[PDB]
Amino acid sequence: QLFVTVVDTTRSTNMSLCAAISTSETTYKNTNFKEYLRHGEEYDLQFIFQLCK
Amino acid sequence: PKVSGLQYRVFRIHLPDPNKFGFPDTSFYNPDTQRLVWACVGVEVGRGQPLGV
Amino acid sequence: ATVYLPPVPVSKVVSTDEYVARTNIYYHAGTSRLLAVGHPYFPIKKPNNNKILVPKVSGLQYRVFRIHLPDPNKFGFPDTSFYNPDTQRLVWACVGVEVGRGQPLGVGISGHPLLNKLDDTENASAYAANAGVDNRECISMDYKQTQLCLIGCKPPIGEHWGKGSPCTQVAVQPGDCPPLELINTVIQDGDMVDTGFGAMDFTTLQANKSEVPLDICTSICKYPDYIKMVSEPYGDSLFFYLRREQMFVRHLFNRAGTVGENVPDDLYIKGSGSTANLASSNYFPTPSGSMVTSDAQIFNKPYWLQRAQGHNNGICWGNQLFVTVVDTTRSTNMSLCAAISTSETTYKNTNFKEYLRHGEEYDLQFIFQLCKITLTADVMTYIHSMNSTILEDWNFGLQPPPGGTLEDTYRFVTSQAIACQKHTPPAPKEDPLKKYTFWEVNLKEKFSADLDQFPLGRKFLLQLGLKAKPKFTLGKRK
Amino acid sequence: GISGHPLLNKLDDTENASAYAANAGVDNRECISMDYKQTQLCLIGCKPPIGEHWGKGSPCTQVAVQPGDCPPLELINTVIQDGDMVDTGFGAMDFTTLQANKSEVPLDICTSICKYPDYIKMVSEPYGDSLFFYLRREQMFVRHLFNRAGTVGENVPDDLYIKGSGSTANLASSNYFPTPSGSMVTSDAQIFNKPYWLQRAQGHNNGICWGN
Amino acid sequence: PAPKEDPLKKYTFWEVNLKEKFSADLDQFPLGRKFLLQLGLKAKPKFTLGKRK
């Protein structure tokens, strides 16, 4: 087994966007352009394994 | 789901055994004399992404 | 059973220097101080036309140089008289770049007239039951301090988060956050650096297009996808990179809007009125840069190149160089007023018309080593596999097969057939040296037989042992 | 050096901000004083050294840039003279004809040229008698972002944001200027006070005087 | 016949199967190249250097 625990808060991207209810409405209400935030989290794991006996 | 870097990211890595896997050449290896085991001798932890918190 | 092959032919890619010899022949080159007068908040165009009045040039933009070099045999020398072009062929290797910088101390900056805001939520200045309608503020910020430099010989591909196709999980719908789907594409000249919400398009993703400054809403922000590029075995898209980046949070702000999608609200107890309401869930960290020192810089110092990344040794493929710089440090913001007309001996703001400019300055100075590639058949095989165009430029020509057999119905001449039919390739190609706008740097007629009487020149001599007067000392003591 | 102007050009706060405002009204200058960024340098030469500054460049007629948008700022190089002002943290430029208000900044720099040393010309010189020794320690930071008073004359395409309502359908000043700061003085930041044995120089001249 | 194997998986994890991604290449992964730079000596290095600031 390998158990690897990573916490990383330093580069962990959070992104901002919104969906419009319509762009015809010239407001910016809570139910017009409805704001949002997401988080995109990237890791990658590479190994190299030496054989043993 | 919730994906934040303030949460523990635990990767459960499940591995076989070398015995259960490749043998290049058989020449000093007898299942009697010895049994084979993985040693992961290098790892890369990739984390290049844009910034956020 | 297993019982391993172990497995072949992979086939692995060998270094170019074990059939390439560097030689003591060197030429020098340079540029003449590249200077740009930009604008950073928005593009300043002529207000009756689409041509720029002042182009948009920020220090928070990747400035991407397509360097182009002539073939060294079509820019041949009379001093080669020990070399053969039938067994050998010539290639530049750029073995040194020094990047001149020296513009006034002055830091890049951005802002937005209608940055989407309600209240401050690093600490509460209000407690609201629900968030506003139509509330936005005049607030300025730069993204973050970025200094980087990369030198390649093909174009570098950067990442960003695109607008995705609708999924179950997240769809492009009101009440539902859009999916972020990864689009990799080559770094354009003037493409923006990150915001601190990362690399993404904001044109499409931000429907409201008033959350972030005008300049980055219009741009796509990229971060270089370094990872994909060193998993290139060849690594000809880059072979040099470094970066220095950092960011700060100077305060959380809360959007004036709120989510329309679900936030669980059975996971904490609900009182009356305001405490039976959700009102913020749309907090955002406002990005800012930080305190800049101007004694520490990547730039003003010579980068000795040779045995470069990939199985590229730093030899020019295509005789091309691709240089991507951000430098925010000396990227001046100018603040000035000129009056349209003055007829007033009292002040008014309506008389004196503010104007701002941006300065972007870079200089490139180069020492190049002439090198040769010793040619045989197996070596020929490796090169066509790498890039057949290189062999062709020189022209050793074809090489049959392919080959192939068509069977189709004939008279001849078709008439009956498919019929007829033509297949156009296309022809025309987009062309991958004009895949995207690039700051053409011409060094085809800026070469020099003069190799020491440069500042780079003097440092080159200091490198090969000492040489030259004065060094050091310096300065220095006590 | 504490310097300041009772009439420094300031509209609104923009660091964290606290209100909105459209285009400027009339008379927004304030009593504000400032400390200039940390700048220490020294240079030793034996022929006057070359500065750069952004001077007054091409006219209003050889471009299409208005009067009220200023004739272009073109880098005009010339020798540093005693009593010349230094780099201000807004770039090193003329401020006599480049501020028509001429009371945007502290009193000293409301007139005269500002220069920064033009190291590239002196050090690429194949004689290097303009200088042959320099050192410096410098830094700057943003104390606070503020906005100039003065009407936009710049071109903001307004169709790159989807319109508000009333006040947020209106367009603010975008005439941001950072104010520099060079605070925290320390006596381990001296480049002075210290002998620099010029047994050899760092130029292309080894420090051997000419003209004495 | 159950309950129940497995005792390893009785807790929530980012499940990572690694049993089939085993290779022998070291010049195609950048991780292979950095490994050789420590080890076989080999890489083949500079990399590049001298001087990059």
Q: SS3 letters for C181-209?
A: EEEEEECCCCCECCCCCCCEECCCCECCC
Q: How far from the centroid of its chain's Cα atoms is residue B29's Cα? A: 23
Shortest Cα–Cα distance, B53 to chain C (Å): 8
Comparing CB atoms, the residue among B4, B34, B43 nearest residue A47 is B43
Are chains C and A in contact at 3+ CB pairs closer than 8 Å? yes
A45, B21, C106, E24, E25 from E21: Cα distances, Å: 12, 12, 51, 10, 11
The owner of tokens 């609104």 is D12
Comparing CB atoms, the residue among B9, B45, B49 nearest residue A13 is B49
Tokens for B44?
A: 């890369």
The owner of tokens 């020929």 is C380
Whole-angstrom distance, CA of residue D139 vs CA of residue D182: 7
Whole-angstrom distance, CA of residue C393 vs CA of residue C382: 16
Backbone dihedral angles phi then psi of residue A49, each to the nearest 5 degrees: -125, 115
Whole-angstrom distance, CA of residue D147 vs CA of residue D105: 13
Which residues are CB-contacts of E35 (< 8 A; sequence separation ≥ 6)? A48, B41, B42, E26
Nearest to D41 by CA among D131, D136, D122: D136
**Residues in chain E after which the backbone breaks (C–N beyond 2.5 Å):** none
Whole-angstrom distance, CA of residue C452 vs CA of residue D106: 46
SS3 call for C378: helix
Whole-angstrom distance, CA of residue C161 vs CA of residue C216: 14
The owner of tokens 């490198």 is C463
Interface contact flag, B50 C144, Cβ < 8 Å: no
Shortest Cα–Cα distance, A36 to chain B (Å): 14
Amino acid at A31: T
User: Do D157 and C213 meet the contact criterion of CB atoms below 8 Å apart?
Assistant: no
- Residue of A21, A22, A23, A26 to mutate, interface with D, max D Cβ within 10 Å: A26
Q: Which residues of C touch E53 (CB under 8 A)?
A: 242, 298, 301
Tokens for C418?
A: 């498919």
Whole-angstrom distance, CA of residue C357 vs CA of residue D169: 26
HSE, CB side, 13 Å, CA atoms: give it for residue D164: 25
User: Do E25 and C12 meet the contact criterion of CB atoms below 8 Å apart?
Assistant: yes
Q: How far from the centroid of its chain's Cα atoms is residue C474's Cα? A: 37
Nearest to D132 by CA among D45, D48, D58: D45
Interface contact flag, C474 D202, Cβ < 8 Å: yes
Whole-angstrom distance, CA of residue C373 vs CA of residue C16: 9
User: What is the β-pairing status of strands D133-147 and D114-117?
Assistant: unpaired
Nearest to B50 by CA among C201, C200, C170, C181: C200
Are chains A and B in contact at 3+ CB pairs closer than 8 Å? yes
Shortest Cα–Cα distance, A45 to chain C (Å): 12
Edge-first strand order for the sheet with A2-6 is A2-6, B9-14, E14-17
Cis peptide before C308 (omega within 30 of 0): no
Comparing CB atoms, the residue among E8, E9, E13 nearest residue B10 is E13
Q: Which residues of C touch A39 (CB under 8 A)?
A: none
Q: Which residues of D touch C141 (CB under 8 A)?
A: 145
Interface contact flag, D150 C349, Cβ < 8 Å: yes
- Residue of B14, B19, B45 to mutate, interface with E, max E Cβ within 10 Å: B14
Closest residue in chain C to residue D141, using alpha carbons only: C291
Amino acid at C63: R
C28, C452, C478, D204 from C469: Cα distances, Å: 20, 12, 21, 7
Shortest Cα–Cα distance, A14 to chain D (Å): 21
Q: Which subunits have 3 or more CB–CB pairs within 8 Å of chain E?
A: A, B, C
Measured distance between the N- and C-terminal CA atoms of chain B, rounded to whole angstroms: 18
Comparing CB atoms, the residue among B22, B48, B53 nearest residue C6 is B22
Amino acid at C252: L
Report which DSSP code applies to B28.
S
The owner of tokens 């359908």 is D169
Whole-angstrom distance, CA of residue C109 vs CA of residue C58: 8
Backbone dihedral angles phi then psi of residue D124, each to the nearest 5 degrees: -90, 0
SS3 call for C31: coil
Backbone dihedral angles phi then psi of residue C286, each to the nearest 5 degrees: -90, 125
Which residues are CB-contacts of D151 (< 8 A; sequence separation ≥ 6)? C349, C350, C352, C353, C354, D23, D24, D173
Whole-angstrom distance, CA of residue C235 vs CA of residue C312: 6
State this model's resolution in angstroms. 12.0
Interface contact flag, B14 E14, Cβ < 8 Å: no
**A16 beta partners:** A37
Q: Which subunits have 3 or more CB–CB pairs within 8 Å of chain D?
A: A, C
Comparing CB atoms, the residue among E14, E15, E22 nearest residue B9 is E14
Tokens for C128?
A: 């609201």
Closest residue in chain A to residue C201, using alpha carbons only: A17
Comparing CB atoms, the residue among E24, E25, E48 nearest residue C309 is E48
Whole-angstrom distance, CA of residue D10 vs CA of residue C142: 20
Are chains B and D in contact at 3+ CB pairs closer than 8 Å? no
User: By the CB < 8 Å criterion, does B32 face chain A?
Assistant: no
User: By the CB < 8 Å criterion, does A30 face chain B?
Assistant: no
The owner of tokens 């999924």 is C167
Tokens for C93?
A: 């290797």
CB-CB neighbours of C419 under 10 Å: 9
Closest residue in chain C to residue E28, using alpha carbons only: C233
Q: Which residues of A touch B19 (CB under 8 A)?
A: none
Nearest to C170 by CA among C261, C263, C281, C284: C261
Closest residue in chain B to residue C226, using alpha carbons only: B48
Whole-angstrom distance, CA of residue D138 vs CA of residue D118: 16
The owner of tokens 């072949």 is C8
User: Do E25 and E32 meet the contact criterion of CB atoms below 8 Å apart?
Assistant: yes
- Residue of A8, A41, A48 to mutate, interface with E, max E Cβ within 10 Å: A48
Comparing CB atoms, the residue among D14, D89, D200 nearest residue C473 is D200
Closest residue in chain B to residue A49, using alpha carbons only: B40
Backbone dihedral angles phi then psi of residue D49, each to the nearest 5 degrees: -105, 160
User: By the CB < 8 Å criterion, does C138 face chain A?
Assistant: no
Q: Which subunits have 3 or more CB–CB pairs within 8 Å of chain B?
A: A, C, E
User: What is the β-pairing status of strands D114-117 and D85-86?
Assistant: parallel
For the four alpha carbons of C425, C426, C427 and C429, in that order, the dihedral sign comes to negative
Method for this entry: cryo-EM
Tokens for C66?
A: 């397509």
SS3 call for A44: strand
The owner of tokens 């539902």 is C176
Radius of gyration of chain C (CA): 29
C310: alpha, beta or left? (left if phi > 0; alpha if psi -120 to 50): left
Whole-angstrom distance, CA of residue C353 vs CA of residue D149: 9
Comparing CB atoms, the residue among A1, A45, A46 nearest residue E8 is A1
**C246 beta partners:** C145
Q: What angle do CA D152, D158, D160 make, to 5 degrees?
A: 130
User: Do D108 and D11 meet the contact criterion of CB atoms below 8 Å apart?
Assistant: no
The owner of tokens 């770049």 is C97
Whole-angstrom distance, CA of residue A27 vs CA of residue C134: 6
**Residues in chain A after which the backbone breaks (C–N beyond 2.5 Å):** none
